[PDB]
């Protein structure tokens, strides 16, 4: 049996399998992606994030 696609891949920096990477890529996280720490919203442009 072959489990190379559900076992973790150490070449990735986050220890996630290929199918988990696909499942993370399909969902657009949209808001609350990474962190909106303060200082980042102190800089402003014409189009502002929700």
């Amino acid at each position: 049996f072959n489990f190379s696609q559900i076992l973790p891949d150490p070449s990735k920096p986050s220890k996630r399998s290929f199918i988990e990477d696909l499942l993370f890529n399909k969902v657009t996280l949209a808001d609350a992606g990474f962190i909106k720490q303060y200082g980042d919203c102190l800089g402003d442009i014409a189009a502002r994030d929700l």
């Binding site: 962190i35 909106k36 720490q37 303060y38 200082g39 919203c41 102190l42 402003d44 442009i45 014409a46 502002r48 929700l50």
Partner: protein
Amino acid sequence: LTESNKKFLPFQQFGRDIADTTDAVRDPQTLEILDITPCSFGGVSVITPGTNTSNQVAVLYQGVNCTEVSNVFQTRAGCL
């Protein structure tokens, strides 16, 4: 009040936001466009052991960078 790159049309004075609040103004003496950004604010959390044990208290400023606030630590949840 910061300098902004929002090109106002010459008949416009105020530039507004999604929630119908002013976030861009035109200074009358010097015709430039200023961006308004509200001051730093956030929640305060108290991390403590029980008062049956001790009285030492840690304070977490949630979501705030540590430079804009002793044992100061960066947590990705707030300045500790």
